[PDB]
């Protein structure tokens, strides 16, 4: 594990086919991983065949930069979020025709429920909304002004069984819509994430015990990092957001929180994602600056476990 | 194999593409002055214009487009850091089978 997840080897580069300046901002694998899905700075979404490298479809989703993509487990649905243009988030269908199903006009981030995906959780500033996928109707809003932490990058989220919600550093019980606990605030930005094991809560550098609210680990190398887990919850990838984007990503052992490797890519990292096989890692990689009137941003594909 | 719907980007008309470009540049500017320093906007606009319009001789449409992509990236960077600062939809699918 420390051997495999410390070795990465670039095998291809994807660029926007018709552009003079590539403008990718976001990536995700499709449900069956035949395609890489790439959002762009202008609000389009491009699908590239991983095997052949060909672009196969382009869609027009938003009017500003794509910030988040999440295909549903079955591949019939897709969530998107953008940057400044309303609607900021939306729900698309991916069957015979690409179509828009629902708008979440003011939600800057959006996520499927984790057990059965019949619900969407949305985030508007410090407020969480839960929606029903069929109707689009808002089922409940979670908010408490006396308990808020006002994290700058707040992103509400379900726990693996869908019985709990984390929002702005507050544990909510969904069934009763009552606040259960409020986690101590030690940073200004990162609001936190559930471990796939269902036992721990990870908030910036602090790992808390979900049952007893004990402080279990302090992991300094996670500070201000955007966190992603692999499919089995054994490995964490992180990329630092202080352009404030770091040029490295770090791998961690997800069971004991021990560091594995730091991989310098010599490009600013905008985003990254993993398949379900631990075969490939995809990274959005930027070079240049506003001063040079050049912000070429490309996607590099890596083999995991080979050097 | 996995299948995906055909793209709809090509289903936008020429006329509506030009209007999209004109309308969006104006809107991004009005939005960006509430997040980014005003003189940064002015500076990127004027430099983009000197380079692609005056120096390289590209159309005003191409020039506006290179400029928009740069501002969209600036806005992306601003919002990812976290922000506490004080209209026709998508084109139709192509007809199935064609």
């Amino acid at each position: 594990r420390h051997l495999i997840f410390s070795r990465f080897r670039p095998i291809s580069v994807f660029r926007e086919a018709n552009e003079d300046e590539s403008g990718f901002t976001c990536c995700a694998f499709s449900a069956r991983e035949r395609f890489l899905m790439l959002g762009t700075c202008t609000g389009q979404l491009k699908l590239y065949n991983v095997f052949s490298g060909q672009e196969e479809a382009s869609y027009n989703c938003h009017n500003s930069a794509i910030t988040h993509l999440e295909p549903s487990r079955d591949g019939s649905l897709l969530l998107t979020s953008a940057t400044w243009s309303q609607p900021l988030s939306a729900l698309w269908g991916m069957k015979s025709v690409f179509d828009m199903k629902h708008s979440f006009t003011e939600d800057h981030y959006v996520e499927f429920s984790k057990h059965s995906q019949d619900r969407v959780i949305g985030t508007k500033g410090d407020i969480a909304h839960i929606y029903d996928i069929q109707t689009g109707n808002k089922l409940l809003t979670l908010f408490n002004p006396d308990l808020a932490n006002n994290y700058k990058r707040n992103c509400a989220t379900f726990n693996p069984t869908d019985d709990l919600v984390l929002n702005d550093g507050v544990l909510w019980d969904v069934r009763s819509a009552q606040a259960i606990h409020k986690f101590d605030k030690f940073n200004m930005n990162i609001s936190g994430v559930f471990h796939p094991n269902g036992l721990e809560v990870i908030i910036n550098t602090e790992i808390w015990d979900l049952r007893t609210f004990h402080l279990l680990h302090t992991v300094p190398a996670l500070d201000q990092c955007r966190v992603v887990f692999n499919h089995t919850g054994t490995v964490m990838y992180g990329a630092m957001l202080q352009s404030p984007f770091g040029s490295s990503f770090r791998t961690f052992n997800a069971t004991d929180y021990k560091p594995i490797a730091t991989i310098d890519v010599k490009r600013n990292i905008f985003d990254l994602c993993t398949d379900t096989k631990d075969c490939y890692l995809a990274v959005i990689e930027n070079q240049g600056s506003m001063d040079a009137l050049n912000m070429d941003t490309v996607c590099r594909l890596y083999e995991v476990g080979r050097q | 194999r996995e299948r995906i719907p055909p793209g709809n980007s090509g289903e936008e008309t020429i006329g509506e593409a030009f209007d999209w470009l004109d309308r969006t540049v104006e809107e991004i500017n009005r939005a960006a002055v509430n997040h980014l320093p005003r003189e940064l906007i002015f500076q990127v606009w004027r430099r983009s214009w000197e380079y692609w319009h005056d120096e390289m001789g590209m159309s005003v449409s191409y020039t506006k487009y290179r400029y928009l992509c740069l501002i969209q990236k600036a806005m992306f960077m601003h919002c990812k850091k976290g922000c506490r600062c004080l209209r026709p939809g998508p084109p139709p699918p192509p007809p199935p089978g064609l």
Binding site: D20 | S9, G15, L21, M58, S59, S61, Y62, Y65, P94
Partner: peptide
Amino acid sequence: NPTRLREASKSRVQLFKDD
């Protein structure tokens, strides 16, 4: 102009580049 981009074999960028 009601010509589709696909009818013209153009992307947005190419359309703006030509004029």
